Write a structure and sequence with these properties.
The chain is an alpha+beta fold and 139 residues long. 27% of the residues lie in helices and 31% in strands. It holds the Pfam family Profilin.
């Protein structure tokens, strides 16, 4: 229970603008997310591509999250030991882009979006440590 406690901890810092806990087994569904941002609008279809079997279109054509186009920098989502994916939002005309980290647990996908100017490595680190925390409650 209490999936918002993980959202709140993730947000307490101020360095992040969006977070969400999405279950991807059988019928994907967002379990917790920041209201009004963009992860709260992820769809089972997108979740399907994330955990998906076809990963070639990644480095080259990207993917989306809550309808927001993204680019893939690293994908160790299914690879063990890491279980995380690092993306960068896709912007045009010099708009600021953001670092996103997706981390996979036993039952969920933990997603995190940083604010302008926050290193990825920091978004990754916090996402990874939150998924590690969850895997312990076997979730």
């Amino acid at each position: 229970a209490g999936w918002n406690a993980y959202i709140d901890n993730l947000m307490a810092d101020g360095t992040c603008q969006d977070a969400a806990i999405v279950g991807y087994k059988d019928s994907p569904s967002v379990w917790a997310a920041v209201p009004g941002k963009t992860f709260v609008n992820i769809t089972p279809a997108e979740v399907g591509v994330l955990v998906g079997k076809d990963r070639s279109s990644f480095y080259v054509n990207g993917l989306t999250l809550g309808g927001q186009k993204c680019s893939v920098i690293r994908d160790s989502l299914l690879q063990d030991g890491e279980f995380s994916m690092d993306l960068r939002t896709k912007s045009t005309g010099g708009a600021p882009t953001f670092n996103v980290t997706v981390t996979k647990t036993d039952k969920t996908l933990v997603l995190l979006m940083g604010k302008e100017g926050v290193h990825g490595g920091l978004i990754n680190k916090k996402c990874y440590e939150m998924a590690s925390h969850l895997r312990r409650s076997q979730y």
